[PDB]
Amino acid sequence: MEELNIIQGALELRTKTVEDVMTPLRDCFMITGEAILDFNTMSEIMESGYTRIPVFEGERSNIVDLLFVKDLAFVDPDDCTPLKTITKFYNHPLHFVFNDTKLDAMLEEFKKGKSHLAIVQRVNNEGEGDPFYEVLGIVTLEDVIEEIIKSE
Amino acid sequence: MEELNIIQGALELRTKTVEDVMTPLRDCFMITGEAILDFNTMSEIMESGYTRIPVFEGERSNIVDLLFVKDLAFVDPDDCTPLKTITKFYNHPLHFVFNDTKLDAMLEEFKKGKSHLAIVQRVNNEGEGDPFYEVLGIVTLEDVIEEIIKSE
Ligand SMILES: Nc1ncnc2c1ncn2[C@@H]1O[C@H](COP(=O)(O)O)[C@@H](O)[C@H]1O
Ligand SMILES: Nc1ncnc2c1ncn2[C@@H]1O[C@H](COP(=O)(O)O)[C@@H](O)[C@H]1O
Numbered sequence: 001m002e003e004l005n006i007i008q009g010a011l012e013l014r015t016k017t018v019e020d021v022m023t024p025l026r027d028c029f030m031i032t033g034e035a036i037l038d039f040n041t042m043s044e045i046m047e048s049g050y051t052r053i054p055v056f057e058g059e060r061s062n063i064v065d066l067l068f069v070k071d072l073a074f075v076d077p078d079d080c081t082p083l084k085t086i087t088k089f090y091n092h093p094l095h096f097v098f099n100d101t102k103l104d105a106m107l108e109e110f111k112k113g114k115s116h117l118a119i120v121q122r123v124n125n126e127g128e129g130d131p132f133y134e135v136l137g138i139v140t141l142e143d144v145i146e147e148i149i150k151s152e
Numbered sequence: 153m154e155e156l157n158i159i160q161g162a163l164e165l166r167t168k169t170v171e172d173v174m175t176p177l178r179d180c181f182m183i184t185g186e187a188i189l190d191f192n193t194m195s196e197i198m199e200s201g202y203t204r205i206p207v208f209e210g211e212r213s214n215i216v217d218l219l220f221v222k223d224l225a226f227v228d229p230d231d232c233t234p235l236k237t238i239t240k241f242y243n244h245p246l247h248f249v250f251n252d253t254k255l256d257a258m259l260e261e262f263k264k265g266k267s268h269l270a271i272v273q274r275v276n277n278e279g280e281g282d283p284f285y286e287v288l289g290i291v292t293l294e295d296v297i298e299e300i301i302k303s304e
Contacts, residue, residue: 006300013158049222070199
């Protein structure tokens with residue numbers, strides 16, 4: 001049945017972490033904070049089909065923002081408006097989570113609040129002194145859901 | 153727990169029909185088949201935030217097509233390209249289902265295949281002779297999922 005599949009997936013929400021279902025940083029469709037929204041850029045963004053596009057500055061692992069395709073609704077290409085202005089204006093909240101976070105917990109944090117996307121990071125304790133947060137990718141509500149309803 | 157909530161929702165996937173979770177036709181964000189895609193129309197479409205927009209001709213209950221926001225990726229507003237050309241070109245498949253269809257079945261039909269949106273219709277047996285299919289709204293995978301994971 002579907003019932004049984006779903007129940008089992010829900011049973012395994014306890015063990016599994018966000019690192020197991022995440023989209024790793026290299027498979028992620030992202031965009032540079034210095035980008036200009038002109039017909040071709042908005043075109044690539046729309047073509048990607050993703051509702052949410054991480055915004056990075058410098059290295060891809062330095063993620064300062066979140067762009068939503070809806071934010072392009074009122075943008076005119078002829079204006080060649082830089083992405084910075086839109087990220088300042090809407091300023092969508094960025095959520096981070098640890099790679100060891102369990103999926104039930106992630107699901108609970110997804111329910112309360114609007115945010116369906118979280119940046120997955122881990123602690124890198126191998127220094128070079130000061131330990132730093134290392135960004136590994138993104139996880140979404142859809143990732144967790146897909147893990148629940150998938151068959152096996 | 154979340155586990156228990158999910159399991160119960162899955163238990164009730166048996167009784168519930170698509171009519172119970174659907175977005176009724178009057179709450180639906182739709183668009184006329186005669187529309188022209190120029191900056192303001194594409195703007196409304198993008199502003200709506202919906203991935204999929206039913207395309208109706210004449211009455212809102214006559215649904216000939218499905219527009220996806222991705223289909224606007226390469227469209228230039230200055231061209232004032234009519235929506236008909238894009239619906240002909242991409243021709244996304246339209247799926248229909250009966251209001252009495254149970255949610256487990258709907259979920260199964262959603263898994264196999266690409267389509268996450270179905271037009272919900274029922275048989276209107278009160279004539280006036282020939283019985284006709286009456287369109288009541290739309291149901292999506294997200295509607296069913298939301299019914300699974302919601303609390304109570
Ligand atoms: N910017 C992105 N790059 C790569 N994958 C993504 C991105 N956004 C979402 N996804 C994944 O693509 C799937 C559909 O998500 P979405 O189309 O954004 O609702 C899910 O598995 C997401 O985790
Ligand atoms: N064109 C539309 N008009 C009204 N509601 C919609 C439309 N498309 C999707 N929905 C509903 O809005 C929610 C989010 O769907 P979506 O943003 O399209 O992935 C779900 O409850 C859908 O059933």
